[PDB]
Structure formats: structure tokens, C-alpha cells
């Protein structure tokens, strides 16, 4: 359960997240 | 006791036929109508058949079906582990 918490801690996870969000907006 | 098949070597269908369903419902309705204890939370029902269906819905009927192979052996299946279509 703590694994996902650690993954969310590093910036590039948020980076892929809002990149996906931006392409969602574009599509 | 030689006839009984071990649980691992059971080769019959895991679904329950319409005949088995009708027999089970009839037996349970008779037992309920003869003042047997009810295993579910009765809510305003006064018909033994409907309470039998209700008990079947939560899979709480404590009965076992014995299936006879043609040679004479048999296979035992609990009502809890039989899949009933709806």
C-alpha cells in the first residue's frame, strides 16, 4: 500500500499525470 | 462405502438441474410448514414456499444431493456448492 505513496512522491509521476491530462484536453 | 467417490474425482456437472431445484424447494417448504426452524431473516412473509426461495437465495439450505451413477456408485454435492441459474 505504501508503494503507490512512494511512487506519487517523485515528480515525474505527476509529470506523466498532467501530460496525460493535457492530451485528454487536446483530444 | 466403496461406492462413494472422493471429492477430487467428481465428474458431474457443477450446475443444478431444474428437477433438483424443484425437489429441494418442495422438501424445504414441507419442513417449514411442519414448524422447522428458519435460517434467514423472515420479513413479513407467511408462505413456506416463498421462505424456501428466500433461504435458497442466500444459499443457506443445509441439504445434500446424492447423484446415482448407472453402475451403482454415487456422488455427493452440497446445496451450497451448486450453481443455480437465475
Amino acid at each position: 500500500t505504501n508503494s503507490e505513496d512512494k511512487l506519487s512522491k517523485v515528480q515525474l509521476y505527476e509529470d506523466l499525470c498532467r501530460y496525460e491530462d493535457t492530451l485528454s484536453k487536446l483530444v | 462405502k466403496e461406492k462413494a467417490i472422493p471429492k477430487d474425482q467428481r465428474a458431474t456437472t457443477p450446475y443444478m438441474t431444474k428437477y433438483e431445484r424443484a425437489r429441494i424447494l418442495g422438501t424445504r417448504a414441507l419442513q417449514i410448514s411442519m414448524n422447522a426452524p428458519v435460517f434467514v431473516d423472515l420479513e413479513g412473509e407467511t408462505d413456506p414456499l416463498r421462505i424456501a426461495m428466500k433461504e435458497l437465495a442466500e444459499k443457506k439450505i443445509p441439504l445434500v444431493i446424492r447423484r446415482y451413477l448407472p453402475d451403482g456408485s454415487f456422488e455427493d454435492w452440497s446445496v451450497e456448492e451448486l450453481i443455480v441459474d437465475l
Partner: protein
């Protein structure tokens, strides 16, 4: 397909009459049920024939529960689940 398989299962053509089915190996009461009653009874007596009481007609004559559909299995009580409650 079922009718044809029944008619030609003994290695030869068995007609649907007394000569084909009432001369088979089935139970005495089953065979005497139709069209040759008394003679079949006489022959069964003279040959000391044993009936097994498993067909539908033998369980209809004796007023019992034939193994037909709902009667093909037995209902038994499971003690483990009953105690578990």
C-alpha cells in the same frame, strides 16, 4: 435418431411389435403390460423368471416412486453445515 437407434441396436432389425419388443429381455410386468399379458405371465412362471422392478411400469404397478426426473436422486441432511449455524 433415437427411434432408429432403438430399432437397430440388437445387431438386427427389431420391429416395433410384440415379436420385437415383447420378446426382448426386459421385465416380465413391463412386457405383459400390453397385448400378450396372460401368455407372458405363464411363460415367466414356467421358466422361473426374475423381475428387477426398475422400469416405469413396475413402479407404477406397485405404487412407488419411479426414478424419473425428480426421483433420480436422494436428498440427505448435512450435519456439518447444520452444526455450523
Amino acid at each position: 435418431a433415437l427411434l432408429v437407434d432403438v430399432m437397430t441396436t440388437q445387431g438386427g432389425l427389431t420391429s416395433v411389435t410384440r415379436h420385437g419388443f415383447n420378446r426382448s429381455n426386459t421385465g416380465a410386468l413391463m412386457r405383459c403390460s400390453f397385448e400378450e399379458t396372460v401368455e407372458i405371465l405363464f411363460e415367466a412362471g414356467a421358466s422361473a423368471e426374475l423381475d428387477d422392478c426398475r422400469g416405469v411400469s413396475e413402479n407404477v404397478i406397485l405404487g412407488q416412486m419411479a426414478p424419473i426426473g425428480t426421483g433420480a436422486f436422494d436428498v440427505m441432511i448435512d450435519e456439518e453445515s447444520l452444526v455450523k449455524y
